Design a protein around this ligand. Structure first.
Ligand code: OTA
Ligand code: CL
Ligand code: CL
Ligand code: CL
Length: 300
């Protein structure tokens, strides 16, 4: 059994998930967020306590106001980057797709629903009907729903994003997880890993593309959980060595680039479970992938 499994058992036995998680919060980086806190950006932030650090914020390529609440998580050893961002607001959907355009992203991973716990956690930023495309006048972009593949707990959409200035167009894949509760965890490691591997298999993480965009409502809790699991699996894979992966150190590295990644101790505990289970595929048992698809009951 792997060292992360032994660590997992000892933390479970001693009941120390809350203390381990608080240790991470105490040790996490603290960098300034001066642009995010400028008065003119107040209505560009969904949550007053969630801001991108200045050193890693994504800048929009426009001259009026380049601010978006979004961070580039640049994982050097893993050689994968992610853009983590908040669920766009009704006035920032144009900025969101501007950022997708300028950063050359091929995929968007959405881990939340538009309404959760009775509240609007994210704007309806993509078109729900092929024949009702959206136009973002402020950033001069057009967004059309091309097709969607609805499964029982996630939906994959094919979108066309057009730069109306140049009339160039790109296909964006939208991976929408619809049964992951806010401040909660997926239903099982299997359904989570099935979804995560759906993203991987799409090619959206290819280094020929810009960084994948990942968001939940705040871009930190569910987004941090997804990214930690994905990065740890990729590191294990590069080295073919589960024991070289220190999950808490990877999370602390990610938190150099955006605050608050992973919002509960149970989400941390879930990340361990997902990485431990996914290690079976990494280390050469491809049949677990079929097993996850079955256990996830994705068919409708
Ligand atoms: O969507 C997520 O997974 C996430 O981290 N959400 C977060 S983090 C966070 C909040 C929320 C929210 O959704 O209310 C409220 C304000 N404090 C921090
Ligand atoms: Cl200002
Ligand atoms: Cl909203
Ligand atoms: Cl935190």
């Amino acid at each position: 059994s792997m060292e992360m499994e032994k660590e997992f058992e000892q933390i479970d036995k001693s009941g120390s998930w809350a203390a381990i998680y608080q240790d991470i919060r105490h040790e996490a980086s603290d960098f300034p967020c001066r642009v995010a806190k400028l008065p003119k950006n107040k209505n560009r932030n969904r949550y007053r306590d969630v801001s991108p650090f200045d050193h890693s914020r994504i800048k929009l390529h426009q001259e009026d106001n380049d601010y978006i609440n979004a961070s580039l998580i640049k994982m050097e050893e893993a050689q994968r980057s992610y853009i983590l961002t908040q669920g766009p607001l009704p006035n920032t959907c144009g900025h969101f797709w501007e950022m997708v355009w300028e950063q050359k992203s091929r995929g968007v991973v959405m881990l939340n629903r538009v309404m959760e716990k009775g509240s609007l956690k994210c704007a309806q930023y993509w078109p729900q009907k092929e024949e009702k495309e959206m136009i973002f006048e402020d950033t001069n972009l057009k967004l059309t729903l091309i097709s969607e593949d609805i499964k029982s707990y996630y939906t994959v959409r094919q979108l066309e994003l057009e730069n109306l200035t140049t009339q160039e167009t790109r296909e964006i894949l939208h991976f929408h997880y619809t049964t992951w509760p806010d401040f909660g965890v997926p239903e099982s490691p299997a359904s989570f890993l099935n979804f995560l591997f759906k993203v991987r298999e799409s090619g959206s993480l290819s280094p020929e593309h810009g960084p994948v965009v990942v968001h939940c409502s705040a871009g930190i809790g569910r987004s941090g959980t997804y990214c930690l699991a994905d990065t740890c699996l990729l590191l294990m894979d590069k080295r073919k060595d589960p024991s070289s992966v220190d999950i808490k150190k990877v999370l602390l590295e990610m938190r150099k680039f955006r605050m608050g990644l992973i919002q509960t101790a149970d989400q941390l505990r879930f990340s361990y479970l997902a990485v431990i289970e996914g290690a079976k595929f990494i280390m050469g048992d491809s049949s677990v992938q079929d097993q996850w698809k079955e256990l996830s009951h994705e068919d409708l």
